[PDB]
Design a protein around this ligand. Structure first.
Ligand SMILES: CCS(=O)(=O)N1CC(CC#N)(n2cc(-c3nc(Nc4ccc(C(=O)OC(C)(C)C)cc4)nc4[nH]ccc34)cn2)C1
Length: 276
């Protein structure tokens, strides 16, 4: 990929940055526009981590995963998605998005995670902020900066604590079952329509009490999660789908559902409420 005209920035993070660029190979100003992700503090440690991430994305080919384009301090060139993040899209089209459309997005997030498991990859950052919208009918998982290849010899011991599983908060352990936990949180968001007042951090802080800060919030989030304290059922959210959230939020890692089973449940529910 040829050294690209920085049109505008799409996403800015602490160590990462995603901008929209134009290839313009023949300098005809007609080359397709791509999404370029570069590191903020291009260190030696981050460069090594950022190098793996490029290898993981180029190894993934799925309808609900952003298609890698190539490389160009290195730069990661990806597919550009015009509708941006799902939480920006959903908030701007709430009244035009029903539960069936909601379950469509849920179903293809599920299958993308299913495919992810096949390669033995743990995403570790499953949230609506990392879900991009290509058109009004297809969303994709857009970031893999925290993804860790499961070792050859079932978990990876290594932050968005309000999306984390209890074993990740305590033992710093991440697995497919920890991604299942975070998926249930993603399902929670999906049905609150990205209302900030009902966001998981805003909801957990009211249950914990906001006279707490620093790492003492993590202390009380652990004690609350261990005492069967969970995010409430969002209003309008059917009972059957709220149970999927609770099933993902089981303290016993062994009883959390699989991603293949969630995709079939989501599809069955979506078709059942579509045909009456
Ligand atoms: C770790 C921090 S991070 O910096 O590295 N980081 C955040 C991250 C989360 C994820 N995934 N992100 C991805 C994109 C992104 N956006 C797009 N299209 C658009 C199109 C329109 C708009 C827009 O209207 O602007 C507003 C502010 C949304 C209204 C924005 C984006 N296409 C993409 N292709 C690949 C990535 C990507 C932006 N942020 C990756």
């Amino acid at each position: 990929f040829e050294e690209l005209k920085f049109l505008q920035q799409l996403g800015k993070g602490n160590f990462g940055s995603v901008e929209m660029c134009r290839y313009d190979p023949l300098q005809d100003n007609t080359g397709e526009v791509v999404a370029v992700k570069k590191l903020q503090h291009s260190t030696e440690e981050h460069l090594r981590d950022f190098e793996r991430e490029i290898e993981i994305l180029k190894s993934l080919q799925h309808d609900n995963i952003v298609k890698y384009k190539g490389v160009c301090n290195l730069k990661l060139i990806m597919e550009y998605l015009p509708y941006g993040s799902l939480r920006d899209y959903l908030q701007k089209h709430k009244e035009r998005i029903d539960h069936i459309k909601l379950l469509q997005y849920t179903s293809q997030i599920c299958k993308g995670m299913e495919y992810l498991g096949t390669k033995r990859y743990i995403h570790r950052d499953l949230a609506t902020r990392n879900i991009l919208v290509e058109n009004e009918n297809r969303v994709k998982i857009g970031d893999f900066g925290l993804t860790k290849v499961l070792p050859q010899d079932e978990y990876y011991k290594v932050s968005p604590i309000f999306w984390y599983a209890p074993e990740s908060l305590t033992e710093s352990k991440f697995s497919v079952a920890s991604d299942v936990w975070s998926f249930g949180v993603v399902l929670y968001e999906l049905f609150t329509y990205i209302e900030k007042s009902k966001s998981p951090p805003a909801e957990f802080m009211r249950m914990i009490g906001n006279d707490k800060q620093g790492q003492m919030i993590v202390f009380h989030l652990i004690e609350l999660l261990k005492n069967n304290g969970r995010l409430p059922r969002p209003d309008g959210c059917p009972d059957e789908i709220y149970m999927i959230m609770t099933e993902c939020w089981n303290n016993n890692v062994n009883q959390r559902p699989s991603f293949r089973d969630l995709a079939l449940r989501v599809d069955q529910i979506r078709d059942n409420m579509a045909g009456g």
